[PDB]
């Protein structure tokens, strides 16, 4: 899945880079790139290579020396920059890679210096759990928007997102050169899709595993009730509406695509389920662990592995991605 | 006290260099860019950030202008503990702090963007152990020691100086390409008074480590050939050497040159034992990794135990000094 996403989207990144060339940004002394929420895995390496290779390839054609490249790798201060920097030791030459700790909800970089901003699977995370999920907890059974969720949950999540995403765009707007491009890829939904397993498979199946622990009386039902993940899956329409209100970007590309969550290149339904569960753990573990402690979380994932395995044998789940490319105007 | 003494004595030099930036109206540019070479993870980088931030804010008040934004690059080798550094920096408004992993012997930053470069106790470390500390035959010159000593043949001295000339030149050439016209660079490093002999006067730590090693050779727990052909990639230059190297690189003017010598141990401690133990701990903390890599964990732990006994003994008779060289450059042409 992670592989599928990066490979499907690579041409979009490359097209955005090509836009930079018809502005002669490759003729400037340095090209500045930012990756928002880079984590520590291989995706940042691949973003660096894509830009580096495309920049080198084009300067070969035009018989000029390539601009130098500066890549800022942004993530929250708790990110494992140590590992990231150790792995980057095995691009160089004319290539200067920085760590930029901080939240992308706010200023991170000098005014109008960025030529390219990139983000893959970060900007769906909210700055806080949305307000108005309370006293008394609305959204009783669940940890995200669901089939069973009252209309107010939906509206609260959307409102939080509108705030956050607007603050993201405003910050990036201040930091980008005229005609700079920004490529944003995030977990999303098809508008005509219902809530529940269609769009938020992972949040639904986690709430199931929690509910099994409540049922075993190992967790208070009030805890599940007033637990909510600070994460939203927008439609492309929502994204585009938010962008429309911030008058400093032109939309150059908008896209939604839906894949199977489970890995195709595996024939056995077992393993397929276990892998998907492992995958889900790997990006939900820290938020779950922090809320329920190590002992209970270990139990939650064991039941999760049983739920997904069962799901593989009947209706296999999907996952949906929204992609937008913006150009800085005015 | 020592690390504290160095940062506090040199703070005015940093501030003067910053003030030079103001008379170039760099505070009127959109961003002021600062680099700290070899920042490690301790409190010194925080203090450099504060010094610049405070001075920049203070002077924009005075001249009634819009404050430039501040960008600070914190450079160190990859596998420096940037995790801890970044966590501590969280306890930062129009103030953008970056990690810049890599060696300062080489390019690290875009061409001509830096206004201020700062470095405290880094650039004395060489890029490699210097070549030519072994004869044609294959015999190791510099028999007893791990740095330049009283007992060292002339070729050791000349090889270390040559390595430093290479390294320091490469540092200056790289920074020259990366600094704006009239940018300042403040370099503070462990050094020597020219008229000082080699040995305990200038390289206390290398001398006392070679002692501890020699005690392990004496207990036959380490081959004498290992000590013989082991050499630390570190030099303590005179201010004259530094100035000669700078003179050959035609892109900097010297604005300040300084040598000063302090007691190594913390003076505000009355007990000789603790004074010695502290100095030893201090010495371990900056020599551990290169000692450990060479002799393994088991014998290194023994080396530091004997080191702690040697320094404690030294505190009670002749207390050691340590010497610092400081230079400030301006980017010209
Ligand atoms: N406000 C914020 N500012 C910066 N990083 C953030 C953030 N909120 C979440 N993140 C980071 O976003 C990342 C999401 S995981 C995706 C990582 C990478 N883009 C990839 O494709 O693999 C995490 O590392 C998380 O710490
Ligand atoms: N070539 C090189 N490039 C970058 N950092 C280097 C380096 N050689 C040594 N260093 C770093 O220089 C540091 C010296 S310790 C000094 C820490 C800090 N400047 C202070 O005043 O406390 C070490 O962390 C070491 O890893
Ligand atoms: C890192 N990450 C997420 O953060 C994520 C996700 N699906 C939804 N989200 C929120 N996937 C597949 C993922 O790899
Ligand atoms: C890192 N470091 C050194 O590298 C050093 C030193 N004194 C001498 N040297 C070489 N001190 C105090 C120090 O902290």
């Amino acid at each position: 899945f992670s592989q599928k996403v990066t490979s499907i989207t690579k041409p979009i990144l490359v097209n955005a880079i090509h836009s930079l060339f018809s502005e002669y940004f490759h003729r400037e002394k340095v090209l500045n790139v930012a990756d928002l929420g880079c984590a520590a895995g291989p995706n940042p390496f691949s973003v660096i290579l894509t830009v580096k290779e495309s920049l080198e390839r084009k300067c070969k054609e035009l018989n000029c020396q390539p601009a130098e490249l500066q890549v800022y790798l942004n993530d929250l201060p708790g990110n494992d920059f140590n590992s990231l920097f150790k792995d980057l030791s095995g691009v160089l030459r004319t290539c200067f890679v920085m760590g930029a700790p901080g939240s992308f909800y706010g200023r991170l970089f000098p005014r109008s210096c960025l030529h390219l901003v990139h983000s893959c699977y970060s900007v769906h995370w909210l700055s806080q759990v949305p307000k108005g999920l309370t006293g008394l907890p609305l959204n009783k059974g669940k940890i995200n928007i669901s089939k069973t969720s009252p209309p107010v949950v939906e509206a609260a999540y959307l409102a939080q997102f509108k705030e956050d995403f607007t603050l993201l765009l405003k910050s990036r707007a201040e930091e980008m050169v005229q005609n700079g491009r920004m490529v944003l890829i995030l977990n999303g939904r098809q508008a005509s899709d219902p809530w529940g397993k269609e769009s938020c498979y992972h949040w639904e199946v986690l709430a199931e595993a929690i509910s099994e622990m409540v049922s075993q009386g190992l967790v208070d039902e009030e805890k599940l009730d007033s637990f909510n993940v600070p994460c939203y899956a927008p439609s492309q329409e929502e994204v585009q509406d938010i962008v429309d209100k911030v008058g400093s970007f032109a939309v150059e590309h908008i896209e939604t695509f839906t894949l199977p969550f489970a890995n195709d290149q595996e024939s056995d339904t077992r393993v397929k389920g276990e892998q998907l569960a492992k995958n889900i753990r790997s990006f939900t573990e820290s938020i779950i662990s922090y809320e329920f402690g190590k002992e209970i979380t270990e139990k939650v994932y064991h039941k999760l592995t049983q739920i997904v395995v069962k799901d593989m044998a009947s209706r296999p789940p999907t996952n949906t991605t929204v992609v937008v490319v913006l150009s800085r105007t005015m």
Side-chain angles (χ1 to χ4, degrees), chain A residues 16-90 92-283:
Chain A
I17 297 163
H18 276 85
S19 296
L20 302 177
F21 294 163
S22 66
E23 313 276 353
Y24 302 96
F25 287 155
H26 62 281
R27 293 313 257 107
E28 290 188 20
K29 80 175 187 216
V30 61
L31 193 89
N32 295 311
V33 171
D35 184 31
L36 315 181
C38 57
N43 167 87
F45 311 152
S46 155
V47 170
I48 297 172
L49 273 192
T50 299
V51 178
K52 188 187 159 149
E53 280 162 8
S54 292
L55 183 70
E56 273 162 7
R57 211 86 64 183
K58 220 277 189 286
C59 289
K60 266 213 170 86
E61 293 155 10
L62 288 169
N63 279 107
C64 52
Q65 284 204 340
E68 287 166 338
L69 175 68
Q70 175 169 228
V71 181
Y72 291 100
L73 298 193
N74 160 258
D75 204 297
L76 284 172
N79 187 234
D80 180 9
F81 288 95
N82 290 349
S83 302
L84 180 66
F85 289 169
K86 272 149 176 131
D87 301 341
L88 276 159
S89 283
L92 261 182
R93 340 251 133 59
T94 43
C95 189
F96 314 122
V97 177
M98 310 295 169
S103 161
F104 48 59
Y105 294 126
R107 290 288 310 274
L108 279 168
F109 307 107
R111 286 192 169 88
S112 50
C113 65
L114 299 181
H115 302 93
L116 178 70
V117 180
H118 164 280
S119 191
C120 179
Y121 265 64
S122 313
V123 299
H124 53 235
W125 292 109
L126 306 162
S127 61
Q128 54 176 10
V129 172
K131 310 293 200 191
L133 301 185
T134 42
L136 206 68
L138 315 172
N139 197 54
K140 296 197 83 201
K142 304 302 202 159
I143 74 181
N144 209 288
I145 316 170
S146 203
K147 302 146 171 151
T148 69
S149 57
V152 272
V153 179
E154 288 182 59
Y157 270 97
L158 172 59
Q160 189 48 47
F161 181 72
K162 299 216 210 157
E163 262 186 48
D164 284 344
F165 191 72
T166 305
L167 177 52
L168 179 90
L169 291 179
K170 266 157 158 34
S171 316
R172 303 295 77 84
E174 273 165 64
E175 293 167 352
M176 284 168 70
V177 298
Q178 229 80 57
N179 296 323
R181 299 324 206 256
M182 173 155 61
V183 178
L184 303 181
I185 303 143
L186 60 155
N187 180 238
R189 79 185 194 279
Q190 195 53 29
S192 70
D193 269 352
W195 295 109
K197 283 216 217 164
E198 285 279 320
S199 20
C200 314
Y201 176 79
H202 35 280
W203 303 138
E204 201 80 21
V205 151
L206 273 168
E208 264 190 40
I210 308 301
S211 204
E212 172 75 33
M213 307 288 289
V214 159
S215 177
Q216 290 174 31
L218 282 164
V219 166
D220 314 73
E221 195 192 292
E222 291 67 21
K223 203 166 186 197
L224 166 54
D225 280 34
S226 51
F227 179 50
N228 294 302
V229 158
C231 201
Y232 188 57
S235 80
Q236 68 178 65
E237 293 97 333
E238 290 168 347
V239 169
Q240 192 166 22
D241 287 346
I242 302 175
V243 167
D244 283 351
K245 270 200 71 178
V246 181
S248 29
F249 294 112
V251 170
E252 279 199 334
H253 181 126
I254 184 93
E255 178 167 339
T256 310
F257 68 86
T258 306
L259 305 181
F261 219 149
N263 186 268
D264 259 357
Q265 323 280 269
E266 178 54 61
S267 300
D268 182 11
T269 279
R270 313 201 147 270
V271 179
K272 206 158 178 95
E274 294 171 20
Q275 257 234 326
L276 182 48
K278 174 121 199 210
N279 198 261
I280 289 168
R281 182 205 255 270
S282 210
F283 73 79

